[PDB]
Scaffold this active site. Structure first.
Site, PDB file in Angstrom:
ATOM      1  N   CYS A 149     -10.733   1.736  -4.673  1.00 49.26           N
ATOM      2  CA  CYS A 149      -9.694   1.830  -3.654  1.00 49.26           C
ATOM      3  C   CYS A 149      -8.512   2.494  -4.403  1.00 49.26           C
ATOM      4  O   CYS A 149      -8.737   3.573  -4.942  1.00 49.26           O
ATOM      5  CB  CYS A 149      -9.347   0.473  -3.023  1.00 49.26           C
ATOM      6  SG  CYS A 149      -8.892  -0.826  -4.202  1.00 49.26           S
ATOM      7  N   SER A 150      -7.318   1.900  -4.468  1.00 49.22           N
ATOM      8  CA  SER A 150      -6.181   2.490  -5.198  1.00 49.22           C
ATOM      9  C   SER A 150      -6.161   1.911  -6.646  1.00 49.22           C
ATOM     10  O   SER A 150      -6.496   2.629  -7.597  1.00 49.22           O
ATOM     11  CB  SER A 150      -4.866   2.200  -4.468  1.00 49.22           C
ATOM     12  OG  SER A 150      -4.681   0.805  -4.240  1.00 49.22           O
ATOM     13  N   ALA A 151      -5.829   0.610  -6.790  1.00 51.14           N
ATOM     14  CA  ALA A 151      -5.799  -0.089  -8.081  1.00 51.14           C
ATOM     15  C   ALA A 151      -7.200  -0.597  -8.497  1.00 51.14           C
ATOM     16  O   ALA A 151      -7.460  -0.859  -9.684  1.00 51.14           O
ATOM     17  CB  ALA A 151      -4.792  -1.228  -8.037  1.00 51.14           C
ATOM     18  N   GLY A 152      -8.095  -0.681  -7.516  1.00 50.21           N
ATOM     19  CA  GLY A 152      -9.473  -1.103  -7.719  1.00 50.21           C
ATOM     20  C   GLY A 152      -9.648  -2.597  -7.896  1.00 50.21           C
ATOM     21  O   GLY A 152     -10.545  -3.026  -8.626  1.00 50.21           O
ATOM     22  N   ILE A 153      -8.819  -3.406  -7.197  1.00 48.55           N
ATOM     23  CA  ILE A 153      -8.888  -4.868  -7.344  1.00 48.55           C
ATOM     24  C   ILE A 153      -8.889  -5.613  -5.983  1.00 48.55           C
ATOM     25  O   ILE A 153      -9.651  -6.529  -5.850  1.00 48.55           O
ATOM     26  CB  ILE A 153      -7.826  -5.455  -8.350  1.00 48.55           C
ATOM     27  CG1 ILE A 153      -6.375  -5.255  -7.858  1.00 48.55           C
ATOM     28  CG2 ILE A 153      -8.013  -4.850  -9.733  1.00 48.55           C
ATOM     29  CD1 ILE A 153      -5.205  -5.638  -8.837  1.00 48.55           C
ATOM     30  N   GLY A 154      -8.115  -5.177  -5.000  1.00 49.23           N
ATOM     31  CA  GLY A 154      -8.025  -5.860  -3.704  1.00 49.23           C
ATOM     32  C   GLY A 154      -9.128  -5.563  -2.714  1.00 49.23           C
ATOM     33  O   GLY A 154      -9.978  -6.417  -2.446  1.00 49.23           O
ATOM     34  N   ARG A 155      -9.087  -4.366  -2.123  1.00 41.85           N
ATOM     35  CA  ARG A 155     -10.132  -3.895  -1.203  1.00 41.85           C
ATOM     36  C   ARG A 155     -11.470  -3.797  -1.925  1.00 41.85           C
ATOM     37  O   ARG A 155     -12.496  -4.149  -1.348  1.00 41.85           O
ATOM     38  CB  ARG A 155      -9.754  -2.543  -0.587  1.00 41.85           C
ATOM     39  CG  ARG A 155      -8.521  -2.605   0.310  1.00 41.85           C
ATOM     40  CD  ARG A 155      -8.305  -1.239   0.908  1.00 41.85           C
ATOM     41  NE  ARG A 155      -6.920  -1.036   1.300  1.00 41.85           N
ATOM     42  CZ  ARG A 155      -6.446   0.081   1.841  1.00 41.85           C
ATOM     43  NH1 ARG A 155      -7.251   1.110   2.074  1.00 41.85           N
ATOM     44  NH2 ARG A 155      -5.175   0.170   2.176  1.00 41.85           N
ATOM     45  N   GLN A 168      -7.272  -9.932  -3.766  1.00 37.06           N
ATOM     46  CA  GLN A 168      -5.848 -10.096  -3.937  1.00 37.06           C
ATOM     47  C   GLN A 168      -5.161 -11.106  -3.044  1.00 37.06           C
ATOM     48  O   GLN A 168      -4.235 -11.778  -3.494  1.00 37.06           O
ATOM     49  CB  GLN A 168      -5.171  -8.725  -3.765  1.00 37.06           C
ATOM     50  CG  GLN A 168      -5.387  -7.830  -4.954  1.00 37.06           C
ATOM     51  CD  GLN A 168      -4.476  -8.248  -6.076  1.00 37.06           C
ATOM     52  OE1 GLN A 168      -3.254  -8.293  -5.914  1.00 37.06           O
ATOM     53  NE2 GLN A 168      -5.051  -8.594  -7.233  1.00 37.06           N
TER      54      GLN A 168
END
Ligand SMILES: COc1cccc(-c2nnc3n(Cc4ccccc4Cl)c(=O)c4ccccc4n23)c1O
Length: 489
Positions: free
Chosen positions: A423-429, A470
Site C-alpha cells: 500500500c503506502s507504508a506497507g503496514i495498515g491496508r 493499524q
C-alpha cells in the site's frame, strides 16, 4: 512495558495526573475523546501540560510536530532515545518519564465482572497447567483463579486503601504489579502445590461457525475497542532491531524515515551491483502460502522492487492503494503502460494486458532479466483501486471477491514464490489484506469447523513487520470480512 498508555482517561484527568503525580518530562498517551480513532500525547513541560495530536486513518500513527510511526510503542521508544526531535512555536518537548497506568482493563488476564463458577468453567474448557485470570469479587476486591496439573485454585486479592495484597506480605500499587510479582515468585500452597502463573486464559479463540455470535457480542457497548486495545498492549514485545533501515545508504530507500523493516525478517537483496545493494523496506510474512509486506515504491526503489520480485520468484503483486491519494503520491508507477516494454536496471518488464474489474485492475506483466531470455515469468498485478482515502470499506464483499481471485491465481502457479502485498507504508491496508487472507485460508483447508483467533494471528504477523493492522476500524473489518466469507460458504 507500555504502562504510559492510559485507555480510559479524559484530557482533564491526564492534566491532573501529570500535575500532581508527574514532573517536567513526564508523559502519557491516551485515546482521543474529542475525535475517537485518534490519540493524544500528554506531556508535562515547565510546570504545564501539552496535549499533542496523534492521527491514524489506517496507514500510520502521525504525530503533530513529529513523525510517522508504525506503533505507539515504537514512537515512545524513538523519542525517549532521540531528544531534540519533538517540537511544539518550534520549542523542543522531551519524553523523559512515562507516567504509569494502574488500570488492568487491557491486561490479557483481566475479566472484571465474572463468577467463580464461570471462571472455573472457562479454565476447564480452554485452560492448561498454569493458565490464570483476575476477576472482580463476589466486593471491591479481586480474585486470582489459576489452573494446575488437574484443579482450579481461587486466591483472594484484597484492595485496601488503593493497594493490592494476597492477605499478607507486600502491598502493590496495581493488580499488574501483583500479577508480575507472583508470576516471578510463585505462591506455594501448604501441601506444596506451586500456583504458577504461566500464561493468561485464552478469551479470543473462537470456532469459525460461531463468528456471527462473537461479532454480535463484540458489537455491544464497544467490545471490539476493548479486544483491540488488549492486542495493542502486546506491541511492547515487538521492538526488534531495525538497524539496517537506519544505515546512511538505506535512509532514502524508506518512504517514511521511522517506519522500518525488522532486521530478522527483511528481504535481503542478492543481485548486488559490485556497495549497499541488499536493502528494500520489505519483510517476509509467514503464517504461524507466504507474503512479502512492502511499501509503495519510490522513484529510487523501483529497480530494487523488481530485483526482489525476481529473486523471490513472486508471481502475484497485490497493490492496495491508488498511485496518488489526496494529492499525495502513495506509490510511483513501477510498471509499464499497456503493451509497453521498460527496463528497470537489470530487470525488463512488459505490460502484456490490463483488465478492468469493478473494484480493481489486473495487469499481466512479463518479467525477465536483461541478457537472459530463459528467465521470463508472468507476474500478475492485482490493483485494488476503490479503498476509501480514510477508514475502511463499508462492506467487505469487494475485498473478498478480489482476495478470492488473487488466491486462485497464486494457487494455479507451480512453485510460485511469496505474494507481494503493498500500500503506502506497507503496514495498515497491507496488514489487513494479509491477515484476512491468512484467516480465510484456515477456513479453506479446515472448513467452518475450525478454530480462528483474530488478535493471535495479528500478533504473529506484527512480529514479522511493525504495526501490521493499524486501526480498530481495520480490526473490525477483518472480523466483518471473515463473517461474510463464512456466511457465503
Ligand atoms: C533488541 O532490540 C533492539 C536492538 C537494537 C536496536 C533496536 C532499534 N531498532 N530501531 C530502533 N529505534 C528506531 C530508530 C532509530 C533511529 C532512526 C529511526 C528509527 Cl525508527 C529506536 O528509536 C531505538 C531506541 C532505543 C533502543 C533501540 C532502538 N531501535 C532494537 O529495537
Amino acid at each position: 512495558s507500555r504502562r504510559w498508555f492510559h485507555p480510559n482517561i479524559t484530557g482533564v484527568e491526564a492534566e491532573n495526573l501529570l500535575l500532581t503525580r508527574g514532573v517536567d518530562g513526564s508523559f502519557l498517551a491516551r485515546p482521543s475523546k474529542s475525535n475517537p480513532g485518534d490519540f493524544t500525547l500528554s506531556v508535562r513541560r515547565n510546570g504545564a501540560v501539552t496535549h499533542i495530536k496523534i492521527q491514524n486513518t489506517g496507514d500510520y500513527y502521525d504525530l503533530y510536530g513529529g513523525e510517522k510511526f508504525a506503533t505507539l510503542a515504537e514512537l515512545v521508544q524513538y523519542y525517549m532515545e532521540h531528544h531534540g526531535q519533538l517540537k511544539e512555536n518550534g520549542d523542543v518537548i522531551e519524553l523523559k518519564y512515562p507516567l504509569n497506568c494502574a488500570d488492568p482493563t487491557s491486561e490479557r488476564w483481566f475479566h472484571g465482572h465474572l463468577s467463580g463458577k464461570e471462571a472455573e468453567k472457562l479454565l476447564t474448557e480452554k485452560g492448561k497447567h498454569g493458565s490464570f485470570l483476575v476477576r472482580e469479587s463476589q466486593p471491591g476486591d479481586f480474585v486470582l483463579s489459576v489452573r494446575t496439573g488437574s484443579k482450579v485454585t481461587h486466591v483472594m486479592i484484597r484492595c485496601q486503601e488503593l493497594k493490592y495484597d494476597v492477605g499478607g506480605g507486600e502491598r502493590f500499587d496495581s493488580l499488574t504489579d501483583l500479577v508480575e510479582h507472583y508470576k516471578k515468585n510463585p505462591m506455594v500452597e501448604t501441601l506444596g502445590t506451586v500456583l504458577q502463573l504461566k500464561q493468561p486464559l485464552n478469551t479470543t479463540r473462537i470456532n469459525a461457525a460461531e463468528i456471527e455470535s462473537r461479532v454480535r457480542e463484540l458489537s455491544k457497548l464497544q467490545g471490539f475497542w476493548e479486544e483491540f486495545e488488549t492486542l495493542q498492549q502486546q506491541e511492547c514485545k515487538l521492538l526488534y532491531s531495525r538497524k539496517e533501515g537506519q544505515r546512511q545508504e538505506n535512509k532514502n530507500k524508506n518512504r517514511y524515515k521511522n517506519i522500518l523493516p525488522f532486521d530478522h525478517t527483511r528481504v535481503v537483496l542478492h543481485d548486488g551491483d559490485p556497495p549497499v545493494s541488499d536493502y528494500i523496506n520489505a519483510n517476509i510474512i509467514m503464517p504461524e502460502k507466504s507474503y512479502i509486506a512492502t511499501q509503495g515504491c519510490l522513484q529510487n526503489t523501483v529497480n530494487d522492487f523488481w530485483r526482489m520480485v525476481f529473486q523471490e520468484n513472486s508471481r502475484v503483486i497485490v497493490m492496495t492503494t491508488k498511485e496518488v491519494e489526496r494529492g499525495k503520491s502513495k506509490c510511483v508507477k513501477y510498471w509499464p503502460d499497456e503493451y509497453a516494454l521498460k527496463e528497470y536496471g537489470v530487470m525488463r518488464v512488459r505490460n502484456v494486458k490490463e483488465s478492468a474489474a469493478h473494484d480493481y485492475t489486473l495487469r499481466e506483466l512479463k518479467l525477465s532479466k536483461v541478457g537472459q531470455g530463459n528467465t521470463e515469468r508472468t507476474v500478475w498485478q492485482y490493483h485494488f483501486r476503490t479503498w476509501p482515502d480514510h477508514g475502511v470499506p463499508s462492506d467487505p464483499g469487494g475485498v473478498l471477491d478480489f482476495l478470492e481471485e488473487v488466491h486462485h491465481k497464486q494457487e494455479s502457479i507451480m512453485d510460485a514464490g511469496p505474494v507481494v502485498v503493498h500500500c503506502s507504508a506497507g503496514i495498515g491496508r497491507t496488514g489487513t489484506f494479509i491477515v484476512i487472507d491468512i484467516l480465510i485460508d484456515i477456513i479453506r483447508e479446515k472448513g467452518v469447523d475450525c478454530d480462528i483467533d483474530v488478535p493471535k494471528t495479528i500478533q504473529m504477523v506484527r512480529s514479522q513487520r511493525s504495526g501490521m493492522v493499524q486501526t480498530e476500524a481495520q480490526y473490525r473489518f477483518i472480523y466483518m470480512a471473515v463473517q461474510h466469507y463464512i456466511e457465503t460458504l
